[PDB]
Write a protein that binds this DNA or RNA. Structure first.
Length: 89
DNA sequence: CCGTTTCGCTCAAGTTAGTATATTAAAGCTGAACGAGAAACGTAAAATGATATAAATATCAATATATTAAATTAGATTTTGCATAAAAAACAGACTACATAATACTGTAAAACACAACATATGCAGTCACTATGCCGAC
């Protein structure tokens, strides 16, 4: 997709967290519940900004999957995105 | 001179900062296959350079005089560019006459199938054998 080096690393850092927080079961078997169970698990730890990037990266991963004949719908576009206000003074 | 500890670096996982596009519409680029006329080449044949010497023929000045090709006219005429207009033939604008399809209407056989009482092979209904290791039992 022609990225600017660093940006690519950011994605990999978000993908490595998904495979460790979500089973390696079929995509169609992945319900919306098990996606919010892991998501909210990082929202209570104060990592609100992290949950926003993880869901945005994971959601886009399925859009490409649907395009290549794998799944019919994205069960990630149903969950809410955690808002995060800047705490930096 | 060498060892030990601090510091410059990069990998790994959180915390923020920034900018915003998809289709129409019509080209523009470039690798690869497609299709004739004119001149430089080349072997072969025809014209010419090679070559020389006494005898034959041309080289040329300076001026008188008869001769003639041919540009320079100058008047004569076919040739050439351009229509004008009517005789003669082509061809729509009419029309009845004639043979021909779409249609108007009568005349008649027969295709296509329901309906109904039988007739019966054949698939389905019900039970045992064919064919060969399981399971269970010993090794």
């Amino acid at each position: 997709r022609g990225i600017k080096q660093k940006t690519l690393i950011n994605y990999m850092s978000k993908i490595k967290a998904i495979r460790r927080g979500l089973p390696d079961a079929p995509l169609e078997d992945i319900t919306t519940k098990e996606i919010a169970a892991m998501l909210n698990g990082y929202i209570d730890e104060g990592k609100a900004a992290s949950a926003k990037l993880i869901r945005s990266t994971l959601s886009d991963a399925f859009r490409e999957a649907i395009a290549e004949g794998h799944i019919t719908t994205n069960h990630v576009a149903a969950t809410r995105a955690a808002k995060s206000e800047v705490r930096r003074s």
